[PDB]
Amino acid sequence: YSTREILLALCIRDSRVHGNGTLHPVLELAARETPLRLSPEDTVVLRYHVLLEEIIERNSETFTETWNRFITHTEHVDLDFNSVFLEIFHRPSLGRALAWMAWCMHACRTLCCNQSTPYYVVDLSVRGMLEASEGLDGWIHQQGGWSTLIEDN
């Protein structure tokens, strides 16, 4: 599984836990376009979902404020996702990787539960986070993959 696949599966899974029973069309589309091969009910996804939820709960206010300033100040959502990714990943710690994945999953949850959010905002955000996250593939590969990182290590 690539980072983009695991992130998208975590977002899908999180929507099933928090939402109204309808997957956002944007998540359906990214599943179609990615070829998502990983099930959101796969045990590695449930385990990461626990870890990312703990990080969110522990950073709940800072996640809300950072998301709120990002989203209210961007004129090009998908480009700016790639900019914050660079700011964090410069050089690559496990904590930093998870902070970014939890922040993305938290942003997706916020976008998808607000029925007033315009489609294009949800769309460009989910595309931006998925594309930016690909920058983690080289590093996670040198750790033997996401499954190995969680089952293990």
């Binding site: 710690s93 496990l94 904590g95 998870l98 902070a99």
Partner: peptide, 23 residues
């Protein structure tokens, strides 16, 4: 640079997570 600041705030949290996992 709101993108700068969001980045740095997330980086701080990344560092906190590492120490957290060490205990």
């Amino acid at each position: 640079s709101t993108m700068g600041q969001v980045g740095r705030q997330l980086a701080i949290i990344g560092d906190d997570i590492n120490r957290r996992y060490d205990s």
